[PDB]
Amino acid sequence: KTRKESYAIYVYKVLKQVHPDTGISSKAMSIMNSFVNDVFERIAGEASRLAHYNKRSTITSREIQTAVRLLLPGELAKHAVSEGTKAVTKYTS
Amino acid sequence: TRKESYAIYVYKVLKQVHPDTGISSKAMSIMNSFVNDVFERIAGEASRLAHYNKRSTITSREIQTAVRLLLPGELAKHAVSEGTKAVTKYT
Amino acid sequence: KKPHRYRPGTVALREIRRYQKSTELLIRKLPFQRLVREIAQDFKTDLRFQSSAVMALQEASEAYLVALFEDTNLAAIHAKRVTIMPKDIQLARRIRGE
Amino acid sequence: KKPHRYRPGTVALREIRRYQKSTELLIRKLPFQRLVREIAQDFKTDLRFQSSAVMALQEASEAYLVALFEDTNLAAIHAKRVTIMPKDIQLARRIRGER
Amino acid sequence: LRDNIQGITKPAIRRLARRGGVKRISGLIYEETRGVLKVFLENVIRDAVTYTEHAKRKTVTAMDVVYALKRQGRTLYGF
Amino acid sequence: LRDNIQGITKPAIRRLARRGGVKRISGLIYEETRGVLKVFLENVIRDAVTYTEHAKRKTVTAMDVVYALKRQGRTLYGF
Amino acid sequence: RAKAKTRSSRAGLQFPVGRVHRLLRKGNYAERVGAGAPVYLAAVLEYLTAEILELAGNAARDNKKTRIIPRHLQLAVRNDEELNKLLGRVTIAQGGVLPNIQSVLLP
DNA sequence: CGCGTACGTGCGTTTAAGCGGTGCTAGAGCTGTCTACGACCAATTGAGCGGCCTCGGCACCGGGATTCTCCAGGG
DNA sequence: CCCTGGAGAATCCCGGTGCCGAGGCCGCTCAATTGGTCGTAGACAGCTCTAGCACCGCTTAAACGCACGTACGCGC
C-alpha cells in the first residue's frame, strides 16, 4: 500500500549496534519514532529560526551545531557536538 | 538602511479608537514586539497546519484555524468575525 | 478471633508502590470515552473519535493529573501535611500558570 | 518621648504598594552588569555586552524573580505562613519544572 | 449524554493519586480533580476540534490530538 | 571578576520581594534567590553566547537575548 | 554512473542522511539546505537514540527483560538528568512515573 | 497555647551607583569580489516497508516461599 | 511503655503453556543515489565610524551593621 516514512528499522540497527542481545516492542518503537520526529522538528525549526535572524538563506552544519547547543543541555550537548563534528569530517573526507 | 516597523500603523489604530491619547516610543517598541511575536506564532501555526494535511498553501482558513488555536475564549471569535468581515470587504 | 485491621497509610503506600512500577491504565476506557464525547458535543455535534485517538487522550490526561498530583502531594509536605486538599491543587495550577 | 515605631509589616505594605505601581528597576545597573560579565566569562573570554543587551537581561531577570516571589509568597499562606522560605522557592521551581 | 463527569470514579481518582505518591486523599479532592480534568479536556479536545475542522474531517484522529497536546508544551509520544 | 554574586544586595532582593507582594522576607532567602538568579542567568546568557557565536559577532546584542529568552517560553517585549 | 553508496555509510552513520535532507527540504525551513546539515542532524539523532536505548537496555536488565517496552523508555528518560531536562515537557504513554516515595511518607 | 529568636524598624556610617566627561579602539555594517554550492534536470538503482513465515518472551496460571509486618506476651 | 517472638496476608521467586506480537525473509518500487549546470548566497578583503570599554571627579541615594522588641515560625 502507501509507503509511510518512519524510523522503525533505523532505531533497530542503532539498538543492535549498542545492545545486540535485547529487543524492542512496537509500542516502544512508536515512542522512539515520535521521539526522533519531535527532536527533528525542534532542531530544524531552531536551525531555520537561526538562519532567519542572520538573514541567511541556507542551513549549514553550524546551524545544526548552534541548534543542538541551545536545546540539548550540558554534557549531552558537547557529545552530540563531538559526534556531529566527527560525522561531518568523515563525510567530507 | 531601512528597518521594517509597525509603529505608524498602530498610531492610526490608536487615533481611530482613542484620539485623545498618544503613545511613547518606549511603549511603541513594546507594541512593535507584541505584533511581531503574534505574527510568528500565527504564521508558525499556519505553516505547521499546512504541513499536517500536506498542504502547499496558506489560505484565510489557515490563519482562522491558528487564531482559534492560539487566542482563547471569546477573544478568538472576535478576530474570526473581524477577519471574515475584512475578507468579505476585500472581495 | 481478631481481624487484621490494617492501620491507614500502609496499604496506601502499598498501592503507591504497586501502581508506580506498573503501566496499566488506571481510568476505565468507556467512562473516559463517554466523557470525551459529552465535552466534544458542546463544541461540535455529530463528532466521532477514533479508538487510538481516545488512547492518546487517556494517557496524556492521566500523566498530566499524576504530575499535578505529584505537585499537589509535594505541597502537602511543604505545608507540614500528608493529606492533599482542594486548595493544594489550586496552588499547583496557579504556580504552573494554568 | 518615643518615635512613631511602625509595627512589623506596616512599612512592608507601603513598599508593596509603591513597587507594584512604579516601574523603576529595583536592581542597580552596575552590580547586575558585572554579574553578566563574570557569568559570560565562563563561556567566552573575549566577549562584550551592549548597554541595551544588559538592559534586556535585567528586566527579564527582575520579572522572573518577581513572578517567582509571587509563587513563593502564595506557598507561604498555603503553608500557614507569612514569611517566605527557601523550601518555598524549591517547591516553586519544581512545580514550574525548573528544578 | 449527561452526568458523564462522574465517569471518573472516586477510586479512579484515588488510583491516579497513588501513582503520584499521594499518602492521603481528601473527600473534596475528587470533585476538584474532576473539574481540573474537565477544564484540561475542554482545551485539548477543542484544539483537536479545530484541527479536525481544518482537515475537512468529521472524526478526530490521534495525530490531531498529538498536535493539540504539542502546541501547549505537553507533547505525547507513542501515537 | 570575582564575588560578583554579592552585587545583588540585600535591599535589592527585598525590593524584588515587595514587588511580588511578599510581606516578610527571611534571612536565608538571599542566598537562595542569588542561586536561583545565577542558574537563570547561566541559561539565558549561555543561550545568548551561542546566538552571538553563531552570528559571527563578538559582542552580545539585546536582539540575541530576545531569542534566547523566547526559545525558553519567556519572550520579552520592548527589547 | 558510479556505485550508489549511501551517505550514511560514507559518514559512518546509521540514520538516513537522504531522508533527513529530504525532510529538511520539504519541511519548509529554509530556501536551501547545506550539505553537512543532514549529516550533523543524523549524528545528533543517532547519538540521542543510542544513549536512551543503552539506558533503556540498562533499565531492561534491572527488571530482567530482554525486550524494550515503554516503561523502560520512560525509566531511561527520567533517570538521566540531561534526558529529564531535555524531555521535561514531554509525556510518554504507557510509561508511568518514577517509583519514588517521600522520606516522611514511610512509617 | 507557649517559647524565642530572628527578622521588622530605625538611623550611623560607609561605599559604590550613577551622571557627566574624555580617549581608544573592538568590531558590525557597508561595499566589492570571486567562488564554491545546492535546486533542478536526466538517469538510474537498491534496501525500506507491506506482507508472509516463523518463533520465543513474557502474560497467564498456579506452586511454593522467603520475608517483612503486625499483634500479643514479657520485663 | 518499649523490646521481641510468632503467624496472617500481600508480595516475590519459580516451573509449565503458548500465543500473539516480535524477529526474519522476498520483492521491488519509489525515494535515495550519481553526474552536470548554472544563479546565487556566502566567505573574504578593505573603510569606517558609532557605540562599548577603561579611568576619573563627586555626590548622594543605596547599602552594611548594630540595638530593640513584638508579629510570627515552630514545638507540643
Residue numbers in the entry:
A (entry chain R): 28 to 120
B (entry chain V): 29 to 119
C (entry chain S): 36 to 133
D (entry chain O): 36 to 134
E (entry chain T), F (entry chain P): 22 to 100
G (entry chain Q): 11 to 117
Paper passage:
In Saccharomyces cerevisiae, cryptic transcription at the coding region is prevented by the activity of Sin3 histone deacetylase (HDAC) complex Rpd3S, which is carried by the transcribing RNA polymerase II (RNAPII) to deacetylate and stabilize chromatin. The five-subunit Rpd3S complex contains a unique subunit Rco1, three core subunits (Rpd3, Sin3, and Ume1) that are shared between the 12-subunit Rpd3L complex, and an Eaf3 subunit that is also a component of the NuA4 histone acetyltransferase (HAT). The overall structure of Rpd3S reveals that the Sin3, Rco1A, and Eaf3A subunits form a large continuous scaffold to hold the Rpd3 deacetylase in position. Rpd3S utilizes the conserved Sin3 basic surface to bind to the nucleosomal DNA positions at SHL + 2, SHL + 5, and SHL + 7, under the conditions involving different H3K36me3–CHD interactions and DNA linker interactions.
To understand how these nucleosomal features impact Rpd3S binding to the NCP, we reconstituted an NCP with two extra 20 bp DNA linkers flanking the Widom 601 sequence (187 bp) and an MLA at the lysine-36 position of the H3 histone to mimic a tri-methylated lysine (H3K36MLA). 3D classification of the Rpd3S–NCP187bp/MLA complex results in one overall conformation containing three classes, in which the Rpd3S broadly engages the NCP at the SHL + 2 position with slightly different local positionings. Further local refinement of Rpd3S and NCP density allowed us to obtain high-resolution maps of Rpd3S–NCP187bp/MLA complex with the Rpd3S complex at 2.8–3.1 Å and NCP at 2.6–2.7 Å resolution. We rationalize that the local differential positionings of Rpd3S were due to the absence of an acetylated histone substrate and that the plasticity allows the HDAC to sample H3/H4 histone tails with different modifications. We named the 3D classes of Rpd3S–NCP187bp/MLA at the SHL + 2 positions collectively as the H3/H4 deacetylation states of the Rpd3S–NCP complex, and we termed the K9Q-locked class as the H3K9 deacetylation state. Within the H3/H4 deacetylation states, the active site of Rpd3 exhibits positional shifts of approximately 10–15 Å. Notably, weak density from a putatively unmodified histone tail can be observed near the Rpd3 active site in these H3/H4 deacetylation states. This supports the hypothesis that Rpd3S can sample histone tails at the SHL + 2 position for deacetylation in the absence of the H3K9Q substrate mimic. In all H3/H4 and the locked H3K9 deacetylation states, Rpd3S binds to SHL + 2 of the NCP via a conserved Sin3 basic surface while the MRGA-PHDA arm binds to the phosphodiester backbone of the exiting DNA linker via Rco1A K320/K321/K328. We propose that the H3/H4 and H3K9 deacetylation states capture snapshots of Rpd3S being in the process of sampling and targeting acetylated H3/H4 on the nucleosome.
